[PDB]
Amino acid sequence: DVLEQDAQIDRLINGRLTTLNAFVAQQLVRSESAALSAQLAKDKVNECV
């Protein structure tokens, strides 16, 4: 029935957004690690190459 289906949709939306929040947080951590690695890479090219 539609009323029960709307309640089921609510919990599904809450689960999906929390999973997306975790995925975005992982991407933010990856970008911060990339910035540190890029700084290391620039120093390595100047120092060794």
Add this chain to the structure above:
Amino acid sequence: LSLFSVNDFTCSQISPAAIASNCYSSLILDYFSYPLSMKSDLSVSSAGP
């Protein structure tokens, strides 16, 4: 429903319109002799004897 007057109509975990709209794999009809007065005793889940 036309053949037998329905003293009580209850459907649990499903919608009567939905069952008509969507084909179901199987249909189970249970025949039992039950008194009209003891509505409370018989339920999908109840403490009735």
